Symmetry: C3
Subunit: 157 residues, 3 copies
């Protein structure tokens, strides 16, 4: 059941428009509805740090630094700049994708690698875990107080 | 006053108030893509599940995905790596629109081997707009400072 | 580029071709929407940032009001603005999220002391920000990823 009018196009599934037309797929003056389905084959235009077609000429120093740093490789670059060097390549009002979510994260680092001899760093993406460990002479504990996830550090023994 | 045009390139709906600027108010599905005319895309899902959800098939899962699926520490966090029947192809492809609900489940897990004032290990989730504070304790001074971009937390004897 | 609307809905086939599975086809049908490798632009989810002047204190939850009024949280995406009932979120789960929403995602990092200063510390850790755990006088701080866990260890030097 496909219907078109001055306000747009609407497709009502074999069974029904559902509560509040939630089961309706449409493109009308009121926007878009996917009817409980998905929007596939879509990209936001966002790139990952380290990706091939980065334009260093229009970049800020911070963005270029991250683009070239392996510690950031793979993280989504929410700040790529285009021509004028002021306007975001990708505008705020652009649908984000699951692939953009997969590259979301922050970098964690330390000047020393445990049992190592080099600096340390890794990415903390969705569902990654960071653990603060007690060590010789130091007790590290956690507790969520009034919403704050507090990690306390004290002398042991 | 609204009109719907169909031409070689696609379908464009111009609201009763004009195409706006750069067709910004326009709602369209054309060869160049889709415009929601400053509005939203509603009644949409990406197919992403939260860890701990039902209908998770343990036999197509990697050890890491399954562990998180069964660990209460991860419960409710969005699962971005669910695999399909072939055990390698993601159930949700990259080029799929993400939803606000997917965002609501984003987060990492913070833990410690001890609970402050307690006697068991600690863990909680850090989602959007959650705060993590590193506190000084007896004999140790914990301070922070943003330097050269880095949020640096320093630890020293008091 | 052939555009057409029939009983099934809207389908736009590029001059070039459909694709390995009609991946280049742009469509609006019973199965949902396909962007044919393009973007969805001029779109908003309706999410606001904390500290936005348009916020309503009267319908706010205790927690949300707290964050709306804590400058440490300013700019971060507000994923829990409540409507009248305060029992329902202004923005529903099944609403496409935007790149602008991603840009405001982040967590607050804080400490009760500012290194070399004399006040409390706080900043936001958004996507691609870096958090470093520093060794100080007497304490050695090291990192290592073990069995997937990003572990930071504290011990007396």
């Amino acid at each position: 059941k496909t219907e078109i009018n001055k306000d747009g196009l609407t497709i009502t599934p074999a069974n029904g428009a559902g509560a509040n037309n939630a089961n309706t797929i449409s493109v009308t003056k009121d926007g878009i509805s996917a009817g409980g389905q998905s929007v596939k084959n879509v990209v936001s235009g966002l790139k990952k740090f380290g990706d091939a077609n980065f334009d260093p000429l229009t970049s800020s120093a911070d963005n270029l630094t991250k683009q070239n740093d392996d510690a950031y490789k793979g993280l989504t670059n929410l700040d790529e700049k285009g021509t004028d060097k002021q306007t975001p390549v990708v505008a705020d009002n652009t649908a984000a994708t699951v692939g953009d979510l997969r590259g979301l994260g922050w970098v964690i680092s330390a000047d020393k690698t445990t049992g190592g001899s080099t600096e340390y760093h890794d990415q903390v993406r969705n569902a990654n875990e960071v653990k603060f460990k007690s060590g010789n002479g130091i007790n590290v504990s956690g507790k969520t107080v009034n919403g704050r996830r507090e990690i306390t550090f004290e002398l042991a023994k």
